[PDB]
Design a protein around this nucleic acid. Structure first.
Ligand SMILES: [Mg+2]
Ligand SMILES: [Mg+2]
Ligand SMILES: [Mg+2]
Ligand SMILES: [Mg+2]
Ligand SMILES: [Mg+2]
Ligand SMILES: [Mg+2]
Ligand SMILES: [Mg+2]
Ligand SMILES: [Mg+2]
Ligand SMILES: [Mg+2]
Ligand SMILES: [Mg+2]
Ligand SMILES: [Mg+2]
Ligand SMILES: [Mg+2]
Ligand SMILES: [Mg+2]
Ligand SMILES: [Mg+2]
Ligand SMILES: [Mg+2]
Ligand SMILES: [Mg+2]
Ligand SMILES: [Mg+2]
Ligand SMILES: [Mg+2]
Ligand SMILES: [Mg+2]
Ligand SMILES: [Mg+2]
Ligand SMILES: [Mg+2]
Ligand SMILES: [Mg+2]
Ligand SMILES: [Zn+2]
Ligand SMILES: [Zn+2]
Ligand SMILES: [Zn+2]
Lengths: 97, 81, 232, 104, 51, 91, 135
RNA sequence: GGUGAAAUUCUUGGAUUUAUUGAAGACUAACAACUGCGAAAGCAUUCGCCAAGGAUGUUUUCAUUAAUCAGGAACGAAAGUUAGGGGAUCGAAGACGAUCAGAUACCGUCGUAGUCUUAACCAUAAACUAUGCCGAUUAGGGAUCGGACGGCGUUUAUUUUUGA
């Protein structure tokens, strides 16, 4: 799962993504999200709620293998992050698989 | 020995020295045109390619990288250009 | 030496009365399992059955070393010795079954030689009958007829490839077998000749052998199975 | 002065090597420094083979061999006459001695 | 129950007899180790903190 | 502006109890007053309440640990052993 | 008294000769190792205790084994020579071969010679120190 | 039993020896070499996981980013020190048996610290190739370990190309 680190860095530079929980849900209502990521140590109730929204909106979900600290530093930010959504891909190819 | 013409070595003697130790360095690699049996196209492939080369048509492998010069698929033909 | 005893019998003692304990011994015959050719393998000694001391209790945990040459009536198997453990005692007869295998000491020392490579591996396996037994394997490098180089050494990467191949073959052959079925495969050395063929590409690898086999666990006694191979 | 070019050790290209126990006095010496002899012999001496041969129950019989590898420290090596002092020029000769193949 | 346990595991608050609710190994940083089973006449060997 | 050369936290004891005894207690006091990152929420706020109780000031979780440390080497080694033993043997 | 058997057949035993550099042991058991038939050591014959390992003492000790085992009915032997082993010399003592001949000359039958010296794969530390016995 | 020869010690309260079974701690024989790897000290049973390194191959990329270093810093055998666990084997100190004119020794039977491991100190060795590091040039030869290139055959496999 070493490839996801390089793919995510490119998306930040080229495409547009939104970080956090409240903003991620608001993107799911619009139905124009393409991929959401979930950290390992997010609360289990919050995890199960997010997957249900994805099932209604039928968008793919990816389970990150690290904590919420590692997800934040994987995006160049200096703060924790638990969930995020990719509104559109840039020059990357994350949505290919 | 003790009386040699260093300016004009024989071509046979220069084909055995290291690629950098001749009178003037020169590469010993080349390019080649590979004929994929499936298609009629032509692709230029380095002799020492480090990457798996895919043909434009029908998406077939043509070479496998290795330590020295890449080995071609058995059912293929090439010419040194 | 006669004249060295100082304390002798000890603090205080007295001589004995009854001697010659061999007047109360008995002799029994020993039998062999089904696959082997000859059944009689020798005689055994024990105290006579009496009150408070049954004889059959003393003849239920003994093992014997019998060379495979004697069992098969063939001098080819002159370097392998196997053990037979007694289970049930009929009238003046002891019944036995398989309990292990081992090379002779001199054959193993003659195989190992300098300027060669020694490859060795082991793996545990269980049969359809719930027998837990372990197998050892051994092989050596083979010289080439036109070879001029002094030493024949394999690369450690190749050694691991052979070792991986050895384990896979042993597990596959012993995966679906019984103890009686497995023994019938040990004496013609089926495992060795199949290993040599598979590892041919990696390196020649002369002298493939199964060094020894010992078993770890046994199921319930199941007297019906023992009589099936015996008394044929 | 150096008495030997190799320091009488045969160790170049590494820093350390585990020692072994001498087979006579149980001394510790590096493995590369010890004198090693490999010997193959019969179980019984040549005069006794006939008595064993005709007392066997296997028609013709071949008594097995015994294989040993003895290895000594230098102090015990030249007291047991395994090796002996050589001349200054004859020291630098590592070919094994030519065993007698005619025996007069 | 101590029977449904492989050898080598550490446990705590072990019952001397089934139903007495804990007697052995119940102090800070202590445990007991199972050693082996006897499937017939079911009985288990254990090692106590004192040895 | 360091205020001490080597005494450290155990400077409140003055010149009592002997030099050696102060060193051993300092080894154990330093590790119990520090803060550790929570394993559930991720924030850096976990502090000891009782002799063997540690709780997070943010997500309010409470966990039982060592006397003066969140976990002990013996207890940590057992989880890996138990995990490795379980998954190969039964799966 | 002895095992009943036809005249053609012969019954087998095994002899375990332990020959160290200080004494020699001659021991005869049944086909398994459980039952001991006879055992005489080299020290019983000699009275000077520096000759317990002498090859002469082994011959005398081996002779009366054949006599004592003759009436039990056993007529053939297997041989298992062993040295001290372990951290020892691993070379059988001087009396190892003398006893073997005396068994053959006395009239007993012989088969399946072997060496059963115990050898370690990697041993504990050996007695003596790092400097050895300096005499 | 042990020795050049003996003694102390253990033994019919069955020693030593024989076969089967169990527990504990240490160590990895033979293969093993004028052979491999690491900055040195050092490193040898199997397999899984984790990060690192040299050489070779290259019609990839950067363009002087380099050499050696007073003070300063990381690692540094064995013995020794501070706290727990472990303690089979060997064995400083110590107690006996012989030897000797004497024997607080060499030889023999016992044996504590130590020998092993976790967390911290110590910074010395004939730490040796008694030979500092970078670069250029100077003579003949045959072996060997790692990578590449060329070639006639033999061997062999669901076999070719590869490997020996
Ligand atoms: Mg080097
Ligand atoms: Mg050194
Ligand atoms: Mg109670
Ligand atoms: Mg003696
Ligand atoms: Mg001397
Ligand atoms: Mg006894
Ligand atoms: Mg062990
Ligand atoms: Mg090597
Ligand atoms: Mg080994
Ligand atoms: Mg300096
Ligand atoms: Mg040290
Ligand atoms: Mg130490
Ligand atoms: Mg204390
Ligand atoms: Mg200690
Ligand atoms: Mg001792
Ligand atoms: Mg003293
Ligand atoms: Mg110095
Ligand atoms: Mg110096
Ligand atoms: Mg030269
Ligand atoms: Mg050559
Ligand atoms: Mg080469
Ligand atoms: Mg080639
Ligand atoms: Zn095509
Ligand atoms: Zn010596
Ligand atoms: Zn928390």
């Amino acid at each position: 799962a070493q490839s996801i680190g390089a793919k995510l860095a490119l998306v930040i530079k080229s495409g547009k993504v939104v970080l956090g929980y409240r903003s991620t849900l608001k993107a799911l209502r619009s139905g124009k999200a393409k991929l959401i990521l979930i950290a390992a140590n997010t609360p289990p109730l919050r995890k199960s709620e997010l997957e249900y929204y994805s099932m209604m909106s039928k968008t793919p979900v990816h389970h990150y293998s690290g904590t919420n600290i590692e997800l934040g530093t994987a995006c160049g930010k200096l703060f924790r992050c638990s969930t995020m959504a990719i509104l559109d891909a840039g020059d990357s190819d994350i949505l290919a698989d | 020995v003790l009386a040699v013409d260093l300016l004009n070595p024989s071509p046979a003697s220069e084909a055995r020295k290291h690629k950098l130790k001749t009178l003037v360095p020169a590469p010993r690699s080349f390019f080649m045109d590979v004929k994929c049996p499936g298609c009629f196209t032509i692709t230029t492939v380095f002799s020492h390619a480090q990457t798996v080369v895919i043909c434009q048509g029908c998406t077939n492998v043509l070479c496998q990288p290795t330590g020295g010069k890449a080995r071609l698929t058995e059912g293929c033909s090439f010419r040194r250009k | 030496v006669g004249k060295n005893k100082r304390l002798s019998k000890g603090k205080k003692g007295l001589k004995k009365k009854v001697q010659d304990p061999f007047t109360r011994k008995d002799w029994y015959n020993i039998k062999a399992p089904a696959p082997f050719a000859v059944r009689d393998v020798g005689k055994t000694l024990v105290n006579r059955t009496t009150g408070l001391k049954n004889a059959n209790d003393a003849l239920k945990g003994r093992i014997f070393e019998v060379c495979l040459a004697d069992l098969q009536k063939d001098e080819d198997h002159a370097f392998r010795k196997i053990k037979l453990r007694v289970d049930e005692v009929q009238g003046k007869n002891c019944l036995t079954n398989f309990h292990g295998l081992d090379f002779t000491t001199d054959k193993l020392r003659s195989l190992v030689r300098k300027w060669q490579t020694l490859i060795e591996a082991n793996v545990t396996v269980t049969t359809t009958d719930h027998y837990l037994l372990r197998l050892f394997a051994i092989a050596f490098t083979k010289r080439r007829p036109n070879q001029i180089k002094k030493t024949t050494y394999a690369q450690s990467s190749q050694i691991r490839a052979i070792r991986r191949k050895m384990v896979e073959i042993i597990q596959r052959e012993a995966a679906s077998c019984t103890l009686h079925q497995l023994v019938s495969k040990l004496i013609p050395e089926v495992i060795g000749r199949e290993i040599e063929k598979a590892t041919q590409g990696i390196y020649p690898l002369q002298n493939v052998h199964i060094r020894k086999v010992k078993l770890l666990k046994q199921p319930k006694f199941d007297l019906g199975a023992l009589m099936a191979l015996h008394g044929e | 002065v150096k008495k030997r070019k190799n320091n009488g050790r045969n160790k170049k290209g590494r820093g350390h090597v585990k020692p072994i126990r001498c087979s006579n006095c149980a001394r510790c010496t590096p493995k590369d420094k010890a004198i090693k002899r490999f010997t193959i012999r019969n179980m019984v001496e040549s005069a006794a083979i006939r008595d064993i041969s005709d007392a066997s129950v296997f028609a013709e019989y071949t008594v097995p061999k015994m294989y040993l590898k003895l290895q000594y420290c230098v102090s015990c090596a030249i007291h047991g006459k395994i090796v002996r002092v050589r001349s200054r020029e004859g020291r630098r000769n590592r070919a094994p001695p030519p065993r007698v193949r005619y025996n007069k | 129950p101590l029977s449904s346990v492989p050898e080598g595991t550490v446990v705590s608050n072990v019952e001397e007899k089934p139903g007495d609710r804990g007697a052995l190994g119940r102090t800070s940083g202590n445990y007991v180790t199972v050693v082996g089973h006897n499937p017939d006449e079911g009985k288990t060997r254990i090692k106590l903190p004192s040895g | 502006s360091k205020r001490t050369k080597k005494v450290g936290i155990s400077g409140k004891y003055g010149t009592r109890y002997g030099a050696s005894l102060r060193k051993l207690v300092k080894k154990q006091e330093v590790t119990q007053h520090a803060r550790y990152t929570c394993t559930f929420c991720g924030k850096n706020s976990v502090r000891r309440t009782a002799v063997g109780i540690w709780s997070c000031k943010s997500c309010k979780k409470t966990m039982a640990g060592g006397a003066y440390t969140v976990s002990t080497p013996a207890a940590a080694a057992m989880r890996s052993t138990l995990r490795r033993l379980r998954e190969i043997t039964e799966a | 008294l002895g095992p009943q058997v036809r005249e053609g057949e012969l019954v087998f035993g095994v002899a375990r000769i332990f020959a160290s550099f200080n004494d020699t042991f001659v021991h005869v058991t049944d086909l398994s190792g459980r039952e001991t038939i006879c055992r005489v050591t080299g020290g019983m014959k000699v009275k000077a205790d520096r000759d317990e390992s002498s090859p002469y003492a082994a011959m005398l000790a081996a002779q009366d084994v054949a006599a004592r085992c003759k009436e039990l009915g056993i007529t053939a032997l297997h041989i298992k020579i062993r040295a001290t082993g372990g951290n020892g010399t691993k070379t059988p003592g001087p009396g190892a071969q003398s006893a073997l001949r005396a068994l053959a000359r006395s009239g007993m039958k012989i088969g399946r010679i072997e060496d059963v010296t115990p050898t370690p794969s990697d041993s504990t530390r050996r007695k003596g120190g790092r400097r050895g016995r300096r005499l």
